[model samples]
Target: STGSATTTPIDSLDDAYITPVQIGTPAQTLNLDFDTGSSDLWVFSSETTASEVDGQTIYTPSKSTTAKLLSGATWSISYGDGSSSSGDVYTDTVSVGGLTVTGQAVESAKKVSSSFTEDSTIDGLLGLAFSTLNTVSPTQQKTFFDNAKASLDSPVFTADLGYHAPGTYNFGFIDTTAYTGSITYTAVSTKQGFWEWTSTGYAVGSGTFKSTSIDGIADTGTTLLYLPATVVSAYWAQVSGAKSSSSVGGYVFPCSATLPSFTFGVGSARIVIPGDYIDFGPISTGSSSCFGGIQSSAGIGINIFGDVALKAAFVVFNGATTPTLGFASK
Candidate 1:
């Protein structure tokens, strides 16, 4: 089932993030970081310039005999954080676990930033994240999943996070190991790239604030969940002796006692953020102060359901069934 090619039409770009499918080999077992923000999977190469390659893993072609370069196609990616990388296009016999996908498209970054150079644990990132805002172009174009639809098992892909471990990112097909019930899927609205939704209401410590529901979106590309400031402030007030600190970007919180659970009602579904995730750690500025989950993104467009939220349930984006995303339990 791994190599069986299938095609599905994609309307929204957010459907591409956190896709299922492995890119490396079983022996290597490389879990790809899917980002639609950019296309290209450039592993560390032996010929890469040492100064340009610092924190990232450099893939030695000798390790795999199937590696091949894409002639003169070159690439460079610059992030909002001011980091960047320059690489070349290449094609290799890339496999996702048991799926031996041949002639898989990839990018080989010959030059990279210090941030990427420092992290050697990651072999390379598979950008299934959206690139509509990306500064890189052409060689750094459409993400691997965007271009590999013709060769993929299904035009559709779903992500089941927190399966085997706390932060495992499963790809290709939904590994059914975690679910035992009938998977219910919600229809996604054909709109923007993010998973947008209308909030019914919010409750903190069983207390409902702002009886009106709101419109929001879910994005896997982001790491932290962003909520409305009023909702966050109300939830923070429930914690005994809970106060916001200047450290940890002011999003951190310190609660002398156990914090209450905050839940957001969306239609018939209720999504909750546990208290443990609220307390990140003590900030360097103060010992008594702790970090909290509620952070502010004042001018940002909509709410983001990041990894913390994604870990709580199984998410199936029915790009195959519809241009919308469907949420389910695992």
Candidate 2:
């Protein structure tokens, strides 16, 4: 999250909240997780009790004049991290940024945990990842992007992640001011929900790991990158005098030295991961071995690249054009 904090006019509301542009309306504001790994927009509802809400903001449908409920269908989601929630469906005139859209589909969860129930800043999550990962059923539920594309001035959306400032995750259109030039697009595979890519090879600290060619997917829902043990061991070997400390959940390394830089080749596009993300915070387990963001996923079939990698670049999921994925520099 890195972008300037600027307040935009939302009807008569003066609050400077980070709202979605295309899939939102004047009455309801949305908080979206610009995840390239999955596709789904969920929110807490007024029906939820104060005890269940805990630290999360529950959207009070009564606050808005135009809120509709989806009579019979029930919705439930379970994340890979073991967190889960369940609720009914609803529709409202949702607004994001300064843009407003009517009849936007939303989820109303009755049961929520502190992790999702405690965020007061965002009313709900607008997942901009891909349709394949969409939890919506009946094959008719249109995502925020799906509904916004028709009404937006420009059908393109872009994300510009700032290092220090709040990241600019813009929608409805691609702002040319943020990038160099034309973006290279890749076709989205319809097989699995994850965004798959072909890796040319792996490199650790400018040295190429010619023996390994890892194929993986970029997922925003996940926090860390899961790599093969051999690749992780090889990367750890390059760090000079780098002793592993058990801080954080994984491996912790000394921040005093210039850490090694690792890059992955995606066709002609090169995706790089900074070393700071590799070092663990402080492993409470009390082991000298530092945890790297890239860990062993020997049992898991494919590598799932999480926010550690997504935060460094701009990803575009083109659903209108027969499902395609495109990446651009921030």
Candidate 3:
């Protein structure tokens, strides 16, 4: 079966993208973050600690006649920022867009970090990454895409993330009208359970394109684009007032600066991110110094092509036996 869902930006900077998900028999719809970086279909539920419950919606299993506890199953996921959530598991009817799946694992949060409680825009996460990264013990659960792939027209999903607007997540089939030019395909490495691929090179604005291979993961959940420090330095060097600020925790420049466009390669194809997108907004309210959307990956072991990069193109997460990634201009 095929499915299509819309994901809207939560903030002006498009920090978080939220997609609606239907859970249980009566279908309690919750706004969830469709994350490509991790693997766990977890949500805020009745099982969550009361103190951790802020203004976010919670899934009540007792109210869902179709909900059934997954005996002895539990899951815990710790994010890179040290934020974490742990919970028990349940199996119930779940659907995204219009695609339905019976007996889909629904992890209920028993405990959550302060970050989650404070940010009530998202009720949970729907991990689109491989099932290999699933945190369930004893028996790892497959992601929603994994379980739905068999019935799909094609074993793939596409992410058309927008800039300060609503985009779409289409499963089973690619929307030809959503992109322009020919779609460029690249081999993907699932060794780390991510939609990781190698970029051929990069260029700043209209500068010459460098010929270097950079391995990175396409993480829809991440807001910024992280690259090697050397590449990041080169990009920032072009801006007259750009500086690596310890106070702001990243490269910051005057809000009035005319930023350079960032371009990355997928095979022989080039995808460009607008300069305005790089000006990630002011560091603080009424501050003149703005944070950059592209930052250094030196601190982190791996480079991440997050929303900052993904929003520039239409991305396909091809889930074939030998996985691949497809990029197209939009």
Which is the leading candidate under lDDT? Answer: 3
Candidate 3 residue runs with Cα over 4 Å from true position: none
Candidate 2 lDDT tens digits, 33-104: 545555666776677656766544556666666777666756667765556666777777655555555676
Judging by lDDT, tell me the better candidate of 2 and 3. Answer: 3
Off by over 4 Å in 2: 1-30, 117-123, 136-140, 153-155, 180-182, 209-213, 240-249, 254-257, 284-291, 299-301
- lDDT, candidate 3, equals 0.95
Worst 10 residues of 2 by lDDT: 7-16
Query: What C-alpha lDDT, on a 0 to 100 scale, does residue 78 get in candidate 1?
Result: 70
Instruction: Give the CA lDDT, 0 to 100, for residue 60 in model 1.
Output: 56
Q: Residue 74 lDDT in model 2? A: 64
Which candidate comes out best when scored by TM-score?
3
Clashes of 3: 1
lDDT of 3 by residue, 1-330 (tens): 999999999889999899999999799999999999999999999889999999899999989999999999999999776889999999988899999988999999999999999988999999999999999987999999999999999999999999989999999999999999999999999999999999999999999999999999999999999999999999999999999998789999998899999999999999999998887888999999999999999998999999999999999999999999999999
lDDT of each: 0.53, 0.58, 0.95
Runs with alpha carbons beyond 4 Å of true place in candidate 1:
2-31, 35-40, 47-49, 52-56, 61-64, 78-83, 130-136, 139-142, 147-154, 167-177, 180-201, 209-217, 241-247, 284-286
TM-score of 3: 0.99
Over the stretch 80-142, how does candidate 1's per-residue lDDT look in tens digits? 336667777656656543345566666666777776676554446665443343234454454
